[model samples]
Target: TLKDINAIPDDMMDDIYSYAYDFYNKGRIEEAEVFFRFLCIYDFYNVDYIMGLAAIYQIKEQFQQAADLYAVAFALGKNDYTPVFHTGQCQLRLKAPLKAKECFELVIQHSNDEKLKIKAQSYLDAIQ
Candidate 1:
């Protein structure tokens, strides 16, 4: 809807995304949050933008908020399990082992990335 008002070009958005990701990588969480929020509002369809914002929330220990946003990305990606794995970690931080277990199971069962699957398996083992 926001993009419908005045859409930023894909090229410009990619540049902005770089700043957002760079800020996050540099541990500039608050700066990253601002950029990511802007990116997410500008392009609601991009899963990476949402994931970046969700990661900031997680670092801030807002586990529920992180999980909620991750779920949004999970649905947006339509089969990308990275968000689900992050949601599972959020669940663990929220002290809901059962929910985390369910999420981990889904990742192991469906994720195409072997590295991600192994990580999810370790997390599952840690929880179990």
Candidate 2:
């Protein structure tokens, strides 16, 4: 069954994730994308895998795709500030200032980290 085949243990996924990040940090984006996508095959709900793929999309200058993936990660409800904040950045690059402002405002509302809040506010101010 598909579920049976996809039931890779958590420890194994962790090792795969480390390898994926190593490739990503070394700028081997294609290799990282392959591994991250593999992880997503088994763990579609995993925000880390989604975010990693989104980051590769961003690096590849696919801002709309990156923003869409980041939105998925944001909907997962983990790492609240990062995905939304990055979504705002993508929106900004795509020339959607109003959409960017909305995303940044959400970051401001949700993030308790003062530095992050400040950064989000800066984006909002810039949009104005």
Candidate 3:
């Protein structure tokens, strides 16, 4: 399966992902971005890598680019509140309150956790 996909072995990718996540958790975001982007080059279908790039973009204040990547992640069926919530945040930064509102609403609709629902609602309230 790894042979069919690309030349890079899956274990190497796992190592890189672990390193990237460690860097990110340590607040070494630029380093994380480099590793994540490198991983993305071989696996464009990996939503985790895409989300990592999107997060770095967000930290760099590149809201539109972050939103675009988050949209891609969402379209890829991430099925989580993270991308949806961040998409709303990026939309707000991009001055698209209406779109941001929609994203927040979706987060509220999809997330079953009360805390997440409250968080999404808070964003929705802010938009209004």
Candidate 4:
């Protein structure tokens, strides 16, 4: 049965995640993408995995997928504003100023990080 073949230790998944993160950080995006997809295969409903997929799409110049997948992470997390910022960037690149402005504004309104607020404000100022 598939269960018998899939009896690998769950604890071992941690190392794979760390490796994937490092790969992304080191700019080896395709390697990270492979590991991220593997992580999703083992854990479908996790935010880390979802976020990984979002970033992969983002760097691959796939704005449409990046914007929407980032939104998925945004919706599932604890009211995170980071994804909104990312979505705004993608939106601007896609030439949707109205929607991007809304995203950046939401981040400025709701996020706690002062640096993030400043970055978001920079975008707003530019658009204005």
State TM-scores per candidate: 0.94, 0.87, 0.85, 0.86
Of the candidates shown, which would achieve the greatest lDDT relative to the real structure? 1
Candidate 2, 45-87: lDDT as tens digits: 8888899999999888899999999999988966577899989
By the lDDT metric, which is better: model 2 or model 3?
2
- Look at candidate 2 and give me any clashing residue pairs: none
Candidate 4 segments whose C-alpha is farther than 4 A from its true place: 1-10
Whichever of 1 and 2 has more TM-score, that candidate is 1
lDDT of 4 by residue, 72-103 (tens): 77887867888899899899989999999999
Residues 13-44, model 3: lDDT tens digits? 88988998899889998898899788778677
TM-score of 3: 0.85
Query: Lowest-lDDT window of 10 residues in candidate 4?
Result: 1-10
For residues 25-44, write the lDDT of model 1, one tens digit per residue. 99998999999999888877
- Alpha-carbon lDDT, every model: 0.92, 0.87, 0.84, 0.85
- Predicted structure 4, TM vs. truth: 0.86
| lDDT score for residue 32 of model 2 | 97
lDDT for predicted candidate 2 compared with the true structure: 0.87
